C-alpha cells in the first residue's frame, strides 16, 4: 500500500481568500454566498468572486452488504427534488443520514441502519467518501460497506417513511448500468461493490 | 440488451400532490421550498411536507477518453464549497457544463471541451446519468465518454481558469480509490471506465 504523491495540485488554502460568507437564507438549512479572491494559474490574483452555496451538513452513507447470500438491501423512499427529472421521485437508495454532534461516520452508519431498514451490522470497511455537487453545495458523503444478514431485512421503517427491498448485488449492478438506480451516493457505493465484490467475500 | 422490469417501485406522480413550490431566495440561482402530500406504505396520505430544495439546472459531463493512449484528461479549478472539507478547494474534475436553451447532452459535452479544455472529441457514448444529491437540490448530471486525442490537451482555458491534466487511465483511477479525486461525476465516470476500458477500447 503506497499512497499517491501531492501532485499535480499545488495551490492550496494559502492561495485564497474567504472574504466572507454572506447568509443569503436560514430555514431548516442554508444558502450562503462565499465572496472570495483566489490566486490563478497564470500567477496573477483574482477579481472578487461570489459563490451561492447550499450549506447543509454532511452525511453518512451505508452500503449493507450480505457476503454469505451476495445480496444487498436497498431502501425506499420519496425524494420530491427528482420529481422534475424522474418518472417517480420514489427512489432506491442506500441507508444514509446526516452527520451531527460527535458522532463519526461509523456512528451515523450504523445508526441509520436500525432507523432505516431495521439492519444490524458486522463488520465495516470504509469505502469512498466524494463531494456530491462542488459547484454548488458543500455536502461531503462517507460510505462504508457493513457485514449484513440479508434474511432480516425487511418492512417499512421511518416525516420519514422507507420501504426495504433485498436483491443480489448482481441485480444491483444491473440497476446501476440500465439507469433504475441513479442517485449519486448508490450508483457510487455499486460501482465500488461491482470492482470488488470478490475480494470483499474472499475476506469476509 | 433486455431492460428490466417495473418493479420494485410502484408509487409514481399519481401519489403525489406537490402543493406549492415556494421561493425562498432568487439569485443567481434559487432556493425553493417544495410543499407536497404524499401517499406512505402502509396506503395512508402524508401530512403536508416542507423541503427546502436548491434548483440549479442540470449538468452534462464529459470524460474525455484516448483510447489509443489509454489515457484521461482532467482539469483543474477552484471550488470553494470544498474548502471546508478538502486540504485544497482546487480539484480534479470532469468537463462539465450547465444544460440551457435547446441544447442536448452531447451539445454542452462537446462545447465545454473546448471551453475547458481546447479538445475536439470524436465518437460519443453515454455512460449514466445521475441525481447529485437528491435529498437537497434536483440537480442531474448526465455523462458522456468521448473519444479525444490526448496529445491536444494542454495549458489554461477558461470568473472560470481551468487547468488540464493527462494522467493515464489507471492513475485516474488509484486516485479515486485513494480519495485524490473525489467529486461525484469523476468517481462516478472513473468507475465507469474502470469497468468498461477494455471493451471500449476494443470497440474504438
Chains 1, 2 share one sequence.
Not at 165 to 190: C, P
Amino acid at each position: 500500500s503506497l499512497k499517491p504523491d501531492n501532485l499535480p495540485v499545488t495551490f492550496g488554502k494559502n492561495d485564497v481568500e474567504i472574504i466572507a460568507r454572506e447568509t443569503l437564507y436560514r430555514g431548516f438549512s442554508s444558502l450562503d454566498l462565499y465572496r472570495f479572491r483566489h490566486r490563478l494559474f497564470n500567477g496573477q490574483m483574482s477579481h472578487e468572486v461570489r459563490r451561492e452555496i447550499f450549506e447543509r451538513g454532511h452525511a453518512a452513507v451505508l452500503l449493507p452488504f450480505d457476503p454469505v447470500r451476495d445480496e444487498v438491501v436497498l431502501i425506499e423512499q420519496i425524494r420530491i427534488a427528482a420529481y422534475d427529472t424522474s418518472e417517480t421521485p420514489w427512489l432506491l437508495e442506500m441507508v444514509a443520514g446526516m452527520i451531527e454532534e460527535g458522532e463519526s461516520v461509523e456512528d451515523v452508519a450504523r445508526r441509520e441502519a436500525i432507523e432505516e431498514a431495521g439492519l444490524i451490522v458486522k463488520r465495516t470497511k470504509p469505502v469512498l467518501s466524494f463531494l456530491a455537487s462542488p459547484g454548488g453545495t458543500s455536502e461531503r458523503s462517507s460510505i462504508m460497506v457493513g457485514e449484513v444478514d440479508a434474511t432480516t431485512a425487511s418492512g417499512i421503517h421511518g416525516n420519514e417513511d422507507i420501504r426495504v427491498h433485498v436483491v443480489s448485488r448482481e441485480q444491483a449492478y444491473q440497476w446501476v448500468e440500465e439507469g433504475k438506480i441513479d442517485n449519486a451516493a448508490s450508483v457510487i457505493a455499486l460501482q465500488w461493490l461491482q470492482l470488488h465484490h470478490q475480494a470483499l467475500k474472499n475476506e469476509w
